[PDB]
Write a protein that binds this DNA or RNA. Sequence first.
RNA 1: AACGUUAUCUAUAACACUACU
RNA 2: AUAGAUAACGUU
Length: 2007
Amino acid sequence: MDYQEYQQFLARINTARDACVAKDIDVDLLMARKDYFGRELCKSLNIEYRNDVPFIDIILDIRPEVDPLTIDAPHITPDNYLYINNVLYIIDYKVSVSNESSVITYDKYYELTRDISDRLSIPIEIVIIRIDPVSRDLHINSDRFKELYPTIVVDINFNQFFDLKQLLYEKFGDDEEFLLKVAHGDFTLTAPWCKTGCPEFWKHPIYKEFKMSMPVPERRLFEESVKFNAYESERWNTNLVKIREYTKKDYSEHISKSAKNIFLASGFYKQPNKNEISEGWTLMVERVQDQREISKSLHDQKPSIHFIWGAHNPGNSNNATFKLILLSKSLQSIKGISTYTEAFKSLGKMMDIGDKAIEYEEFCMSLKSKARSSWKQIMNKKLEPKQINNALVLWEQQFMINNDLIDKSEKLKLFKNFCGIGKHVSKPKILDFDDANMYLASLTMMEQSKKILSKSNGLKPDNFILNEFGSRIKDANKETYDNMHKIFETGYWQCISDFSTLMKNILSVSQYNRHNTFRIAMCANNNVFAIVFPSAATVVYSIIVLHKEEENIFNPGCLHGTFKCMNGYISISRAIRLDKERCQRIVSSPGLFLTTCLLFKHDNPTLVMSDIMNFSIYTSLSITKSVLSLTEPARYMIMNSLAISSNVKDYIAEKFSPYTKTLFSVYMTRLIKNACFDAYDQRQRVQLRDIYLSDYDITQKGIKDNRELTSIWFPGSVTLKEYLTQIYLPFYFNAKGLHEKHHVMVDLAKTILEIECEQRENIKEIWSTNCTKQTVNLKILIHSLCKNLLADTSRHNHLRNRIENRNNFRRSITTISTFTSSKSCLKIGDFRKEKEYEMLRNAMPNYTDYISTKVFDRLYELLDKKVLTDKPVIEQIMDMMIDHKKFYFTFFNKGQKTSKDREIFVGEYEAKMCMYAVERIAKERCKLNPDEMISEPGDGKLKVLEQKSEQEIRFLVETTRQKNREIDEAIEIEKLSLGKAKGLKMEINADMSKWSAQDVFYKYFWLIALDPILYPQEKERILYFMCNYMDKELILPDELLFNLLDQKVAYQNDIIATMTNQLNSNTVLIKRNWLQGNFNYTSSYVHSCAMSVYKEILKEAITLLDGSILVNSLVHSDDNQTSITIVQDKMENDKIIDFAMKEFERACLTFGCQANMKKTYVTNCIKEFVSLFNLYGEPFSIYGRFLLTSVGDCAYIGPYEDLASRISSAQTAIKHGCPPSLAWVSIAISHWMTSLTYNMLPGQSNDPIDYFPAENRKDIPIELNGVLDAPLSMISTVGLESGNLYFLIKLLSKYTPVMQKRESVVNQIAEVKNWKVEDLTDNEIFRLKILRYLVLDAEMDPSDIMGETSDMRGRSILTPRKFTTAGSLRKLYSFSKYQDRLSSPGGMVELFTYLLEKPELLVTKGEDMKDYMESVIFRYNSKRFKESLSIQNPAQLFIEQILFSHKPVIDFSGIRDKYINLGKVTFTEAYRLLMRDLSSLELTNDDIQVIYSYIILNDPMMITIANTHILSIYGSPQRRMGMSCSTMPEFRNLKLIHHSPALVLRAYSKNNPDIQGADPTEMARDLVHLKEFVENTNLEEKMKVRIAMNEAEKGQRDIVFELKEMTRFYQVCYEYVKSTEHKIKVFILPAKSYTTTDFCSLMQGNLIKDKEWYTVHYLKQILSGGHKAIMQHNATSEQNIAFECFKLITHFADSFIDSLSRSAFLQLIIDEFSYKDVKVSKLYDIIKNGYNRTDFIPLLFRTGDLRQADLDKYDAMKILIRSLDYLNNDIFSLSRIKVGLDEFATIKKAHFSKMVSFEGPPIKTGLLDLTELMKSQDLLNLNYDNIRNSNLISFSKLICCEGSDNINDGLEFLSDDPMNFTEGEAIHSTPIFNIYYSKRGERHMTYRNAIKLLIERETKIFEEAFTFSENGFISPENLGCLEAVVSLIKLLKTNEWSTVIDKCIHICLIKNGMDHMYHSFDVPKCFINWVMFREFINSLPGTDIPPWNVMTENFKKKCIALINSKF
RNA sequence: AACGUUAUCUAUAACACUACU
RNA sequence: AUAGAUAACGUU
Ligand SMILES: [Mg+2]
Ligand SMILES: [Zn+2]
């Protein structure tokens, strides 16, 4: 803070030019940070601030009476001291990331002060305060000091110092002397990881080819560089500098040529237009016709939607039996002849139950009841069909196939020709997407669908989502609620819901369907039925629709035929076969449909809901690859069309491959085709917003929001943000796993082998200068690598140690996560038995046998075979790099949502570890590189983009102004503007084609050869590794060989056979394709070096052009974002852009990369990078993806955790900028999906609303199948604790006393003991009982001082148990060993004893090979791990969870245990039993205290959230103008544990604080703290009692129970001992947030309303100083409230009040007002009797005081009161004072929006009441123009005349000093935009003058609005009319419109000087006769003045209504 | 499958819908 | 620089 110091340091940086003083200024910056932290800490702690006070001075201070010069005081200077309770404390402020400085300072101070403490007879306590800059976590060594001050609420931001340090580094980064000076140490290397190098590497054939490739000098340089040793040489850069100097000539020559190329460049770049697009489309259609088989028949189409629908019949019934009878009767009465009419009639006769409906119902209920009585399914009781009429009924809605009632030939025809059950090169058949007839048919189909579906439902729209979230959504936005109502009312919603429910029924009944039975499924609709035919898995079904009259059904091209029948027509759909995944997608479809509709329609009146519905119903239900082939390429086509420069034409001609098998696909293809042209047309209609820079931050930025762009998928006008949403969202409509393994595997192999062939036949040369494809310029690459390595190793000097520490190089193999997971891995060897396949090995000889096992099992096998050991991992990595000669790889399909899947490669363990080592080296190198982005954690790339955009905008504006100063001065001529400099902002968004396949691997070798921090032996070993790796062999998967060997017709041009010697071997040698994803960091790094070369080229070219350039290149892996800002005046921008693109391509090709010009594009402003956008400084993301993933897959273990998993996605959507109403929509959809999973919808069987005392499902807790209910900040912050938390806040608000109602949460939670339990309502009582007994433990006490937090306790209560099969588990070697141990006598008890001996292994990774083996063996005991190990189908789990809803699935024994002191139980019975049990329980005030203490008081985050909810106050709303990213601050600043939690647990397992890698004293402190926590929570005692009681109950030691209890104990300990986790969570907020309170305020204000956001401030200080698991019983202070109040008062008095009356006004407001319900006199008393008095010098001086000591302290911070009096005799400011002749002392500014928190008696000055001015909203702005252009309505609030004559005298009591006004200037750049900023206005513009102009203008307007009589306003008749109206308004009930009219007419009379008559106004004597009053008001000629007509007429209507209602 | 994350759960061991319609 | 399981996003 202290921004004055900020521009002081900025000026110092600007004037800085020497590296020898850069060190000094950096030290000064660090000292400034130190003293700023010290000042803030002292202010927080309410103590005096000192700075290095001498120790003798404090000795004298504490003991003045003792003589000096007798005890030798040490020369140490403590930062501060505190003497209380006869104890002295030494305080020092430290700002570091580690505690080394703190611990050494502690030791020194302690040792020095022991003797003084001994002699002075007073103990000395050393307190060291440490604050970590990146995360503001607090560290206090002394516990006694923490006891003295329980609450510490320090919260500050170091971002200013970080920015200044960044500026310093960028200003001096190139300076080598500066780099070596500021180095924190020297370059050192640890012991080499290996003792000997690899001598056989030099004879490797790959290295021979390498050597032959380079010319002789390069070979020599390489071979000496690989032998260079940094340790041996006197300088580590010697070889680097030598190589750089050698290559400097060639590098400079190439740079000079590339720069001088700019003149040759022409102005014709690759901008797209209609000609290119048309030619590309023609080429595309020609190519498609060549490849795909085009059809022109409508009958050849495939079903766009696998469904047919019809309206429901209200005339009929709804019972299931009646529906079945109606369906049978309809099927039995088919009229006409057709192919399958006889079969359908036979089916109708086949299920004819006759009139025996009751007997059939009895049978089905009996069977159902028998089934719903067992955990497992019933065996050995074979079912038998029962003959009811002519139907052999086997189960409810199931019918046996009776051959008697069906003809055999008809049966075979129906099953084969139609049903397809039982059946036995061409091209894919697609419809002509460009044929006019096909498009006409598509248009007709869509119009018919819209016509049928748009009809009203005819039924009430009541449903679960609306009922349970209407209030929340409507409060969020009324428009969204109305749109949802329109969605629900239409026929589209009914159709989609019926389809979903019917498809769910189909899925349910298809499980138990046999091969000779058929099922019937019904939905809510009485006309829609589904028939499910026998199956084997796949689901085969047909849809049947009964309708009164034909051609009235929704036919998405899937209707097989319509036939006449009784009471109308029956429509049969074609037989549909589907997979379970698509089945579940259809089931979940309604959520996707509703979300898509709401997202598309959100805030867009020009769009029509019908078109959005029509498009969404096809997008959501599209489960075919046809729409997949369209959604993906559309993004690139439309973006390139909108882009400034892109090669869209090629893309269309040789990439866009449409696959249109449906008419909807043709429609969407036409939509995309039109969108391309229309996007090219409208690219110039994008307009940027006006940047409101602040000279220290950028606010109100981004891109203007106006709808001019035509919408793509439907007619309408959309905003650019909405345009991007329409472009990008459809990609997320796709479904993953739509590829069939056969074809996708074949295509992946084809692509890989084709790339291999291309690289073998053509690519033979490695180094070239002409930029050959797949070639690298050697010289340039070497020079760039040398420069980048030098810079990186100069940045940090201990790189090798950091690499070893962070990547666990020293620790064991078992301590690395990636080596112990359960991912797939490959094993090679003689594995004949396990795989058994025989035909493959027999026919095909050369089979490199392989198997796919798990990583952890492979590691266990390797450890068992003694191949690997517990030695440091890196040594074993080197040993394996030498030993492992051969590498093998396999591949499979990722199953992504793209048109073509991305192949995924799996390698062996040895390759995994060696690649891990190399890639971690590269990653730790890249972490220092600013350009590298993978180093930045996830979601921080958005922040990087925002920072780059804002800094480049700043550079552009500054450079433009600086260059055009002279021209602007000359202007205030057209030729001068012509010759003035111009700006150009360009954004290149690029990706690289075939990043892994097409790459010169040799270029990485040099990156290792020139590496300094590697010893020559390590270099040799790594190079031998890569030489072996380039000889990798990819193994064809066994399935590919299976389906290739079973063709019987050889392929014409089989590349696989050619590479496999006609399938004679299953291994293919791959050389130049380093596998997909193996070397991300390495590749990325090299690309960053290439971007650095490009940056140098551009800078050199601009120097030749004599201009300014700023280039920012961001490189993730292959996706590159390059931003260029060029200011120059030589030639037009087109030549510059063409040159930039050409040289970008050249540089990208230089380093062996290849820019995908098809997907690479150029934009003026929009910067897309890894799916993150930055329109213009404004971050943006397509949050629709997270919204659509709300109904994704989940664990399906139980309702609560699935609700949690989907709320997770809802939260993630919120974090990306989703509006609150859409967030509620997503949450509601998630709740609906979870409810539908377990049949919990309202009215259904498992609906628990009836069984609980709840008005609606909101009252039921989440764990009891309730619904979420909390404000958005609650869910987004605490993560599902929001339910209980919000319930408790509601309780506090409802039941706390009025006096403490508005106090802090701590005061209320302490006063809770005074509640009357008899008042609580049942619902509340039930919820409190559930919290107290089901969640908490009864043994806890309200007097506890430390307790477990909600994070350390579970929440799930009801969890079904499924008797799942064991699985195969055969390939698992570790499983075989575990089974042998299990069969071994007494092995398990020995393993359990070992685990008890080291219990920390239960919750922490083992650090030893034996420990890892024991943990792996023990992990098999848990059935969950064994079940998860085998492959599973999420759809199968979902279906089984649906099916087992009614079976006893809840084990009530566990739920009973939770309360004091039979088998499985159903959900409904569980609810009944739980209510019966909780009825017997009881509550008391102590129980409520326990609940509140254990739920709220534990976590400081909970306290902060409760406070920010209770004390929130919302200010003036305003539209969201500029977004900005911000990370969430840590809510737990205090840290009680220092070591890592795993280390602390390891130490606590024993009692030895001294463990490996453990600091002794710090470890002892941590162990003491953990022991205190354990003994205070009684957790050890509770565990011991539990295990003892269980042992007594069983009679023998249930050892597994002991293991589980130990696991729970250590888990709770681990979660308590958690330090800061440094989670990276980014939120898009309307403003920048630095502190925690600012972040909370922005979050609260952003998530309340869609249209606008609010400014939120709190009545009291929300934060609380406490630890994670310690109850807090003390509130905070009020110092910050006083600070805010007095800052606001002083600044308001100075800015808006006349100087003469300022002191009197301040005295009065101190006298009687109060701020935030706190008397301002109390605040003045607090500030006066406080040590923070130097911040209020002017305020004190305006009341005298200051005791002559404040001046002394102020002088010490950087002089007599008598001087001050004369100096400030002139200056009348209340916040600004001048202590010296020029020295100025001021008070920090504050936002005026908090001013609403003031109240008191009115302050009447003249005709103005300043109290309303504080209470006002509009007139608090600082801009003169804003004040002068207000409305009379806002000013009207200030009118209090009581006998004034003129306006001027009353207005005299207003500030006459000139204020600031905002003015703007044009930027004159390629993207044209304005710049608005505030500056000091001249004298003639003041608050007085602004008020005068506003009042005169508004009074004239309102006067001419009320000139009723033609004579004039002052005419006697108009005066009489005004007297009449004032009499009327005074007599009748006061109205706000009446008051504003009265004030306006009164001020008009004041302006005309008629007030004396105004105060003489009365009821006219010529007029209580109300009838003639009505006559007169009805006679009033309401004028049509555009501003005033509305209020006048509304006033007239209100008055006439009131007078009518009066009588 | 590698990565970069983010958030959720931590048990000893033959049948759904059947609806405001 | 928790483990296990699951899910989602982005890159390869
Ligand atoms: Mg990209
Ligand atoms: Zn008056």
